[PDB]
Write an enzyme that holds these catalytic residues in place. Structure first.
Site, PDB file in Angstrom:
ATOM      1  N   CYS A   1     -29.533  25.824  -6.394  1.00 46.12           N
ATOM      2  CA  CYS A   1     -29.115  26.816  -7.350  1.00 46.12           C
ATOM      3  C   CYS A   1     -27.610  26.790  -7.488  1.00 46.12           C
ATOM      4  CB  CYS A   1     -29.559  28.196  -6.909  1.00 46.12           C
ATOM      5  SG  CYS A   1     -31.295  28.352  -6.769  1.00 46.12           S
TER       6      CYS A   1
ATOM      7  N   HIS B   1     -28.176  35.934  -8.117  1.00 44.40           N
ATOM      8  CA  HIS B   1     -29.104  36.125  -7.040  1.00 44.40           C
ATOM      9  C   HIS B   1     -28.591  35.535  -5.744  1.00 44.40           C
ATOM     10  CE1 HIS B   1     -31.026  32.160  -8.344  1.00 44.40           C
ATOM     11  NE2 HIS B   1     -31.093  32.016  -7.030  1.00 44.40           N
TER      12      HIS B   1
ATOM     13  N   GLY C   1     -31.811  25.293  -2.226  1.00 45.33           N
ATOM     14  CA  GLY C   1     -30.372  25.251  -2.016  1.00 45.33           C
ATOM     15  C   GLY C   1     -29.558  24.686  -3.175  1.00 45.33           C
TER      16      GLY C   1
HETATM   17 ZN    ZN Z   1     -30.379  30.299  -8.065  1.00 43.39          ZN
END
Ligand code: ZN
Ligand code: ZN
Lengths: 306, 306
Positions: free
Chosen positions: B145, B41, B143
């Site tokens: 991830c 993503h 932020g």
């Molecule tokens: Zn993520």
């Protein structure tokens, strides 16, 4: 979201770590530039520290009774000097892997990370506070002496603690990086006085703000108070009493949550005075005091730089 | 002595960390050899993940819509492929700083360390368990991830988790390092089912052994039990029931303390069944379940190698 007691990343430190072995007795040192910092009781095999005379022990040792290991070699030692409770160990090469540092004398209530080491190798990292009686409630096995505690902000490591001993009642005592103990403690194997461990009141309050931020805002109540008021409950339950520097440190936390420092003090008392049993705050059944107001602003709010 | 929830030292990982920035949306990746691993993503600015079609989004992107940063440069990307929920990002250089690793699919109840990162830079390290519902109770801001979770023994990092999302009820979900979620979760912004979080019974027992080792051996009592017995109390209070693999994992702990696994089970019940209020175990007011039997043998007993 969430709230964890994070340590600082430890990479900058894992490569300042070395083995120091005198004759026998093996423990850790800190290799910065062309110097190695270590507990002076490395030189104790003499009558043990059941009554050691460091200055007379240290003179049987020469520059090269002292072998260090950094991953694989020696480092050859071209000098030594005893500086209060630390050794220095002048080596011939600067650690290629030294970063920006200072030494600092943390003051009780504040937090640091401990890199627990055994003969020069990392075991783990945990976060701790210096208790108001200048001890730390640590996790140290035999061989961990010389492990150190550090703070970071930039790429700049602020080394602040070096592990020296385990007290006879399970708690840990050490020095700053120029060898003065925190607390009244000495590096002898004797029963060492140790006063009252207080709760770091200002840190508990920071954590209750974290709980409000991170979901848990229902220990709040409908009353309020004065700082003199709270302190008489505070004093009574073995909490450090609060003054005006504490209230101001808590400033922006009160601002982001819209809760007066004093109304937070207000709800803590009902938890301190008439409380006892049931619920849950940020997942703890106790009032936690190893987060400072800065630790919280980080784990929630106000970035640092990098 | 003492007992702390230590994380693994994180240096080996701080230098596998990079920034991945597509168009907009910036998050972390893992740079190993000549590949970068990151949440797919990253490529979502399209209608958001309120209903994203990854395979159709990913085809608008070319090899060089993808910029990474490693401390200072680019890394130029010479390939990409979507592999379940992970991207790969073929880069032209091998990370000079890659160590020995594997990917592994941890199974609930086990523990790892999380290196929390923001646009490629370390923030902190904490220890956690994968809950029996394959979520983690983490600390992740926006932020983070692509942050990952790892185990160590040698100089060998066993990467096991990559952070993908925050569930609508405060908890965290992610993948192994080949992109299959832990749990029934999907990388879409929808309300995600989530079953019962059980207590990791075998881990609680390991921690009660730690308490006996490290001083606190007075939750023990004068009764004993069968595994069928305990499990019916266990099942009832929302504990994972114990079988025979658990009892054997606990083996040497029962040996060093001289306490049958079953008599430990025996005292836990009185804590689980008719308990409630007062004392203290290893400093906790709760039964802790984020230590595995191996975590304990380390923090107390049985060295690893290095
Ligand atoms: Zn993520
Ligand atoms: Zn020492």
């Amino acid at each position: 979201s969430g709230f964890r007691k994070m340590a600082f990343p430890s990479g900058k430190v894992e490569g300042c770590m070395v083995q120091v072995t005198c004759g026998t007795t093996t423990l850790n040192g800190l290799w910065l530039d062309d110097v190695v910092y270590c507990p002076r009781h490395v030189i104790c095999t003499s009558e043990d520290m059941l009554n050691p005379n460091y200055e007379d022990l240290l003179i049987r040792k020469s520059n090269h009774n002292f072998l260090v290991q950094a991953g694989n070699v020696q480092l050859r030692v071209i000098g030594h000097s005893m500086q209060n409770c630390v050794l220095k160990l002048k080596v011939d090469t600067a650690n290629p892997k030294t970063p920006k540092y200072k030494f600092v004398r943390i003051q009780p209530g504040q937090t640091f990370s401990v890199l627990a080491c055994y003969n020069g190798s990392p075991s783990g990292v945990y976060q701790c506070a210096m208790r108001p009686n200048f001890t730390i409630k640590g996790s140290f096995l035999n061989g961990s002496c010389g492990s150190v505690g550090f703070n970071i902000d930039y790429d700049c490591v602020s080394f602040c603690y070096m592990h020296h001993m385990e007290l006879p009642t399970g708690v840990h005592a050490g020095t700053d990086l120029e060898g003065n103990f925190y607390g009244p403690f000495v590096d002898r194997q004797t029963a060492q006085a140790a006063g009252t461990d207080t709760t770091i009141t200002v840190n508990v309050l920071a954590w209750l703000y974290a709980a409000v931020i991170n979901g848990d805002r229902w220990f709040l109540n409908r009353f309020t108070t004065t700082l003199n008021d709270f302190n008489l409950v505070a004093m009574k339950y073995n909490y450090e009493p609060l003054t005006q520097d504490h209230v101001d440190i808590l400033g922006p936390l009160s601002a982001q949550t819209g809760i007066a420092v004093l109304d937070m003090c207000a709800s803590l008392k009902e938890l301190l005075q008439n409380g006892m049993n049931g619920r849950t705050i940020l997942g703890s059944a106790l009032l936690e005091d190893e987060f400072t107001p800065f630790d919280v602003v980080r784990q929630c709010s106000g970035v640092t730089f990098q």
